[PDB]
Amino acid sequence: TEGRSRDGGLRLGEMERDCLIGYGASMLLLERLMISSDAFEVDVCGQCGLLGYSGWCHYCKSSCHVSSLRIPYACKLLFQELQSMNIIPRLKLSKYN
Amino acid sequence: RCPDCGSTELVEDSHYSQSQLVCSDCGCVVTEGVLTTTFSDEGNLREVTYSRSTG
Amino acid sequence: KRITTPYMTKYERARVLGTRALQIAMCAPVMVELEGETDPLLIAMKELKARKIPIIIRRYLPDGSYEDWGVDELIITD
Amino acid sequence: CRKKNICHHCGAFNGTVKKCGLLKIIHEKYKTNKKVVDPIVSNFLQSFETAIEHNKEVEPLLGRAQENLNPLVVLNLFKRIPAEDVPLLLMNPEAGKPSDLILTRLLVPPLCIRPSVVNEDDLTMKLTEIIFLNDVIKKHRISGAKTQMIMEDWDFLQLQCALYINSELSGIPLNMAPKKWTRGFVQRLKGKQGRFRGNLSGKRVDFSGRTVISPDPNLRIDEVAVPVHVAKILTFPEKVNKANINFLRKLVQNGPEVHPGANFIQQRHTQMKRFLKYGNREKMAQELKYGDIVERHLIDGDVVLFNRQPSLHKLSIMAHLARVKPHRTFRFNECVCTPYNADFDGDEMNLHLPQTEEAKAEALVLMGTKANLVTPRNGEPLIAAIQDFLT
Amino acid sequence: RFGSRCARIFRLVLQKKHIEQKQVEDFAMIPAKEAKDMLYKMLSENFMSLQEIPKTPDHAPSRTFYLYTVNILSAARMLLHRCYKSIANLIERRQFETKENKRLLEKSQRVEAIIASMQATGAEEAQLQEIEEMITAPERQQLETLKRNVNKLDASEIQVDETIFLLESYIECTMKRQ
């Protein structure tokens, strides 16, 4: 939340985002902007490259090609609205080696 | 009822800003964090009479 | 043979201290005797001062080939 | 390809297609020219004899009749397109095909992105009015009504769908022009408060604090004096291991009220949290096992990022080693004033505490004060003595 | 697909190149509240093209006349596409029936091969009745049911090819190939 009547927590405005890039740090800005702001987990079906739920791809009627993945909530919301406009991001994933 | 102890001494309580429900009998959280509206959408709020909503 | 600079860049120091502190946070064995300090980062700094950390850097050149340096053979500086 | 005016495959002459009106397209195939009259228009124009006979306004504008295009006509034309032409049209065939380019069915976003109260969100109103129009137009065309107003309803439908995407269109006629602003998809994605500028790039964080600042020269140039009250709130989850076991036991016993204390516990296996206010005993301290994490208060020697709100250059945010002191304001040595540009005439400053061991190490090494005495613009020293020390 | 009256209204339009609802109704006494709705329906089928001359250059709906116009070549084309989808989904069903029944087919073919085998060798006659006691015997009528179904599918496919000839011939002849 934002206010002081409501609870707060300050903003990492875009100028700070550059500052953190500047030093050359990498986990710090990941932590500040994903672990402790809107950390969230989803699942996707690798065959169709689109998100599902509970390890069950409603599109494919299967549970084999599903996988779980961590993603900022605001990014998940972005995928939904874009799909809502029929602009479907069919994301592609692989092993993390 | 408390899953750890089965009692019913649960009392809703808040830390400095964390709303939570704690089994006061044994100190075991069972429901914490909530989601609420914001003042940014407060000025955007409208109203439709339920009769008009029901057609 | 190895072509890169022989010193340890600050970024390498940072990521080595970070990952070793995380490893000692979980109950890993410590390679240097400790006098009673109970903060992972300071134990990791002491270990590096003793140059006993079991971590090998892998420097990827842009094309795809790589070079390996043990954290004991880089010239550590201030 | 625009240079070619006839179809080499079938010799057919085709005119220019032009937007004849707002959300209206026409094909200029049947156009008269200043040169010799084309046979196609010669045969086309003569076909309006019955209309000219019935109505007298046909003849003056018989030459304005062209080939108009509509979603049914278009869609049934592209459904026949040979596949080999698709790649030339910069279409990835795996991405899709021209028929899906014209829409006949619409998704509706899940409830999770629309709150119960915007009473309901504009999308809900937009969807409800669209379906309402759909039902009335289908049953009313089933009623076999007049042409003109059936197609006018069609146009109104199309217009609503357009506005359902984009709320910034301004070509609407006066007599049905909207009288208030509404948020389309582009409105909430774009703008200063949009997703990109408002929420993705920069976003709010927790484990943070804010207060007035006042000086304290009796501290080293790489420390800050966080107040007790804020120290009791911000925490850092430690893991129990063979080195720090006794220390965390003393913290657990002190509880959540004495300063060097803790505020929660998590068990290694059972993910349930344990709250030390209602501990009912110190036996929680005895039952510590390797793997449990204790959310202790902030104590001396933790690493906390200090930041001045109007950031300009990367030296406005630096990592300081904290000490707890009893008053109600952040305090730091004045030789550090020049980078931050602070002025102690009532300013305020932010404080952040990272929640990881990797991020702790990273903040200390790259961002520390002792490693930032010189600015990267030209290599000059910033952190030096200031007024009243020079004197 | 629509009865004699629909064939009546169209061929009216084929002869009367340009016409509107009121003339159509007058010329065929297609009753009010019947011609218009049907005119909207086979408009939806792309069997009829709307010319829509203007009363004003804006071509506004209140300033236009809804002249109807035919297009034989486009017709012949997407009827032909209809037929193409026709042959496909038949083959789909014929194959669906074949693959669903394949288990019983092979179960009956193996015993039929057993009956047919070692027949000229002079083996004893105590096999014809003793093999028929199996469950497939009260399933032969179902096998014949499948057979006539495939037969009935195939006959329609044969026939559909007979239309295809006319469609393909005309779309070819009307095509100048330049």
Add this chain to the structure above:
Amino acid sequence: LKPPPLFPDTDYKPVPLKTGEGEEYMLALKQELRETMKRMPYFIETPEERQDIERYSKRYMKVYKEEWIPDWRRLPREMMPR
């Protein structure tokens, strides 16, 4: 409230099919053809693969066929089956 059955009632129903000795002959010919193109090298089924174990029987029921070769003068000199 309730969207219809997936299968709405229609008054007009498919026109009845033909029958006759000629149509039956064409159906028989169609059956013959669908039975025929399975029995020559042009019907390139997948080559046999993945034997299970060294069974002795393989000496007998092995399928033997000639390596089909068209008039090679009529094709490019790039796809010799050897």
Add this chain to the structure above:
Amino acid sequence: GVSECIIMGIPMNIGTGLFKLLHKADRDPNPPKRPLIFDTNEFHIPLVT
């Protein structure tokens, strides 16, 4: 790009994110193989000519 990695919540590809670390474990790569008794090659000969 740095911005893309940010909005996708993955580490950026510069600074401390430019090299990989390994564990200096005591391990024996490609250890000596387990020997076998029955299925040694010399005793298999195809029956077909």
Add this chain to the structure above:
Amino acid sequence: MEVKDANSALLSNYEVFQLLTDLKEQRKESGKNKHSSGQQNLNTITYETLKYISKTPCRHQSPEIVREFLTALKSHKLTKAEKLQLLNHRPVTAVEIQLMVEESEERLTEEQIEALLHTVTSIL
């Protein structure tokens, strides 16, 4: 997880018995940690297999006598599967030998059947 070869090789019961005995030497040498169900799973499967093979004729064999047996059997032009079945099962009468070889009567003669029976009874 990825399977590379499903039919790479076949093994004798002696080899698996030797392997299980080696594991047993690496078994009960220290206190069970009871860390996870894997302990129980492995102990049950290994002990069950051990007890099953404790009642098999392959017991008390050795690599070199198996090698000599196989070298001698080489001259009989049997299939490897047959050979392995002989070593595993150790037939004692010709009645099961008839079932054992494919085309047993046609491929091999009565005297050759007696020779193989003598070989299995003597060498094993």
Add this chain to the structure above:
Amino acid sequence: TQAEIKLCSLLLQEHFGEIVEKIGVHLIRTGSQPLRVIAHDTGTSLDQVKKALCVLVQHNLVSYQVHKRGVVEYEAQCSRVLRMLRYPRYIYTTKTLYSDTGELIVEELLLNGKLTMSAVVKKVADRLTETMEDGKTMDYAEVSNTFVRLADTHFVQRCPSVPTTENSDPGPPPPAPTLVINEKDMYLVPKLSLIGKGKRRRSSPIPDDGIYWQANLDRFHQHFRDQAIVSAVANRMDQTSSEIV
């Protein structure tokens, strides 16, 4: 043309199977392409691709062309993929206009893709052994008569001939033979006098080498158009008018 593409696919599956269907659909979806890129995109063994392509070119479903820089381009004609549906029609009309010998001639010619005079007449005679028994014998004379009648009546057309190597491009041969079609010998049947009595399945060198022949689909279609016109007139006016037509 997705519906058509599916029709091609299912016809290839019905008539040829899987790998042939794969290669066919890929080619009709990609147009003229050289062998290597086709094999790359498909990813299957080049032997299977080669085998498929030669069986399709044998039945004229696909063609190959010498292209710039000496590469060979391979193309498939989609229309030809819709002709096996009319094979019963071709067989019926030839049976109506010619005896069962002509029916078998057309059957062999279609199912073999191409055949030579000696090969087709010999194969027809051999297969007819299932049709005649009780000591009846079959000689190539009547088979040849029926085929020459078919060819004269335009129902059977000659395939393109290979060019003469010693007369054109001497030395190393080009990648592809670049066949040439000749029109003056279109219906010029080769001459032969060999006769062989059919073997009745008892289970106990080409004078016309290179002279391949194939069914004239255009003639069949023209005949079908005539039949349709005659039928149209019969329903229209009268049988006498239909006979005049």
Add this chain to the structure above:
Amino acid sequence: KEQFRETDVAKKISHICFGMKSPEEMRQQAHIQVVSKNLYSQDNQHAPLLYGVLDHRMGTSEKDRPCETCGKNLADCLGHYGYIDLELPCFHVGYFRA
């Protein structure tokens, strides 16, 4: 005894493919179709309609109600899509230039 399944599905993003959706596939994805104009039932329960908008098959935004498609609350339900058939085909603004 039971057949083995892999216990981990950890993976990393590599690419994002953009595109549009075909209507048959769009319907296949959608859970159900919304068909009722109105929002809430006439009765004083303020309940949403069976196949109207706001049907909890789509998800939830009320702390005390679980989702219908999956028995999960606000913090747990991911959200579900639905579709509407339009009788008369239309144009789409963004692609209109295309």
Add this chain to the structure above:
Amino acid sequence: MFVLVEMVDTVRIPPWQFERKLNDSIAEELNKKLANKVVYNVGLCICLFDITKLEDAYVFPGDGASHTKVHFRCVVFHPFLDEILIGKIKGCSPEGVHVSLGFFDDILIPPESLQQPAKFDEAEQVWVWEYETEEGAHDLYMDTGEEIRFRVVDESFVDTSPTGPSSKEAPYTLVGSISEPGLGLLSWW
């Protein structure tokens, strides 16, 4: 019967295991992970056979547990069709006789595989036997019995993967044959 199959996989090792030499740790982990379970395509895994190749041990960011990849081979239970086998009985049934292999039990001997003369019992589930001259319909197969001789004739894998959104038969099956002389109880032969 026993088959050795090649296998590759990636494994994680928590930090406290660093004291041990890496191969033995990875071996015991791989064993607990694989042992005493069945694969839908190759049969029942018993235990690892050997570890062939090892890659470099990475330490991914966000974790302190070294990751590594292994090439290894394992021994799997997978009898082939028409294989002879000896196994105890475990229970009679109208659809056949159930046979136990000690560590595996999903073997059925159907009445079609059983000798023709005996087709049903005297309402007692214990399967009885009948011959021509001797064995006057008085011999019967005990639910435990000896390790009867039989030859497998059928086998099948059945998948039991979860279906639908989250929130009993064995997946591997075999059939035996006992008709031929010499098969069954050794007391008969």
